[PDB]
Design an enzyme around this catalytic site. Structure first.
Site, short mmCIF file in Angstrom:
data_model
loop_
_atom_site.label_atom_id
_atom_site.label_comp_id
_atom_site.label_asym_id
_atom_site.label_seq_id
_atom_site.Cartn_x
_atom_site.Cartn_y
_atom_site.Cartn_z
N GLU A 173 0.80 -1.29 -0.06
CA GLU A 173 0.03 -0.03 0.00
C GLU A 173 0.59 1.23 -0.01
OE1 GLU A 173 -2.44 -0.60 3.18
OE2 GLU A 173 -3.55 -2.27 2.13
N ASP A 197 -0.48 7.07 6.42
CA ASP A 197 -1.68 6.66 6.10
C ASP A 197 -2.70 6.12 7.24
OD1 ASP A 197 -3.96 4.89 4.98
OD2 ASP A 197 -2.53 3.47 3.91
MG LIG Z 1 -6.63 3.88 1.65
#
Ligand SMILES: [Mg+2]
Ligand SMILES: Nc1ncnc2c1ncn2[C@@H]1O[C@H](COP(=O)(O)OP(N)(=O)O)[C@@H](O)[C@H]1O
Ligand SMILES: Nc1cc(Br)ccn1
Ligand SMILES: [Cl-]
Ligand SMILES: [Cl-]
Length: 386
Positions: A173, A197
């Site tokens: 990610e 994040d």
């Molecule tokens: Mg996301």
């Protein structure tokens, strides 16, 4: 020939396509650019996405979410024992040690492995892309957190295969988010990138280095139990106490349906507070047929979440320490996750990095799917994004 990028998120999923070098993030049936990672089973139908999240408070026992916290794990893992307190649905361990999610569907008991629930979310994302493209979609790049082990990655790949997708690759990610910003295609030389994040249920900080178009994850840290839902809970706890002061000590927290309804409105007011100074939390006939209404200023919300917001900097300091580097050495700070839209969080990060503006041009809850879509196009032979 067509390949999509999918962010299979803990709370929300997102699908993108990179065509002719540009990325389109695809909206679902309701016009939403992200879709809840929710699967619900009723007396008549299997709901996925917005429809599943919308009826969650009416059908808590048969509405599954957080499958990402179970995917690739043994039921006996201490994370599962700990996380299961948060789930209204039943999860048991199979003879092979795999988690089995138990629901009632059309008056019958049904059990699912975490990758089966995730396959239904992936299938919905595949269908979202297919409706938009007017063509079937077979290839995909799916993202996973950088800390996911081989078991979790393999189970995510298997979920894709069950959904009918040919999974070209499983990528991290944070790396997907950095690819979205074209940080790999910059002639600086070495670049230190911090990915911040903060999503719906988790907080991940990753320090990446990029030398010669190649990303390396140098250090990761965060909190698997800090996200937007915890900020909603700060508003819920305040409202519960405010209802007590208004209605002679009556306790909303005794009724789980009253809490769920209050939580839904608290999350909406939180979103409003990211662009307005004030928001109203209103639940008609909340508890004992009593209507509830309260005005929340952005300052009150910031005060309620003060410690949680400030503590987001602790995993930032930890990754810099693990990577043996000073905060002044970070070239780009990328904001990812829908909670990074909170002005206080953006201000805290900017101050920490001595006034450096973070990279937030791409909708933070779309940056991972955006990067996965670029990678899917590259793996399909399309070099137009570079
Ligand atoms: Mg996301
Ligand atoms: N405008 C906004 N302000 C504050 N928080 C917001 C927001 N828009 C979305 N969020 C929060 O983002 C979270 C979902 O973020 P997302 O990035 O889609 O989730 P995820 N599964 O990838 O971790 C939810 O808690 C939601 O309330
Ligand atoms: N962010 C989270 C995660 C779980 Br599981 C429970 C509560 N908050
Ligand atoms: Cl493509
Ligand atoms: Cl189109």
């Amino acid at each position: 020939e067509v390949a999509i990028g999918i962010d299979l998120g803990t709370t929300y999923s997102c699908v993108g396509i990179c065509r002719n070098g540009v990325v389109d993030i695809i909206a679902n049936d309701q016009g939403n650019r992200t879709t809840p990672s929710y699967v619900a089973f009723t007396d008549t139908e299997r709901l996925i996405g917005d429809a599943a999240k919308n009826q969650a408070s009416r059908n808590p026992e048969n509405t599954v979410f957080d499958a990402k916290r179970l995917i690739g794990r043994k039921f006996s893992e201490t994370t599962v024992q700990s996380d299961m307190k948060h789930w209204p649905f039943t999860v048991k361990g199979g003879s092979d040690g795999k988690p089995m999610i138990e629901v009632s569907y059309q008056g019958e008991k049904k059990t699912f492995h975490p990758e089966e629930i995730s396959s239904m979310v992936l299938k919905k994302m595949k269908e979202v892309a297919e409706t938009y493209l007017g063509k079937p979609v077979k290839n995909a790049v799916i993202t996973v957190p950088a800390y996911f082990n081989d078991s979790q990655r393999q189970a995510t790949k298997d979920a894709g295969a069950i959904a009918g997708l040919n999974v070209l690759r499983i990528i991290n990610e944070p790396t997907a988010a950095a690819i979205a910003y074209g940080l790999d295609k910059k002639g600086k030389g070495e670049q230190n990138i911090l990915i911040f994040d903060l999503g719906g249920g988790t907080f991940d900080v990753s320090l990446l280095t990029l030398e010669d178009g190649i990303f390396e994850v140098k250090a990761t840290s965060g909190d698997t139990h800090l996200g937007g839902e915890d900020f909603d809970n700060k508003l819920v706890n305040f409202c519960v106490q405010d209802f007590k002061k208004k209605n002679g000590g009556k306790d909303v927290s005794k009724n789980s349906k009253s809490l769920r309804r209050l939580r839904t409105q608290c999350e909406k007011a939180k979103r409003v507070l990211s662009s307005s100074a004030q928001a109203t939390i209103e639940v008609d006939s909340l508890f004992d047929g009593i209507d509830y209404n309260v005005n929340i200023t952005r300052a009150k919300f910031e005060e309620l979440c003060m410690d949680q917001f400030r503590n987001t900097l602790i995993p930032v300091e930890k990754v810099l320490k693990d990577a043996k580097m000073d905060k002044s050495q970070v070239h780009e700070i990328v904001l990812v996750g829908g909670s990074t839209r909170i002005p206080k969080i953006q201000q805290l990060i900017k101050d920490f990095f001595n006034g450096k503006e973070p990279c937030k041009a791409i909708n933070p809850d779309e940056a991972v799917a955006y990067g996965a879509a670029v990678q899917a196009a590259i793996l399909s032979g399309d070099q137009s994004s570079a």
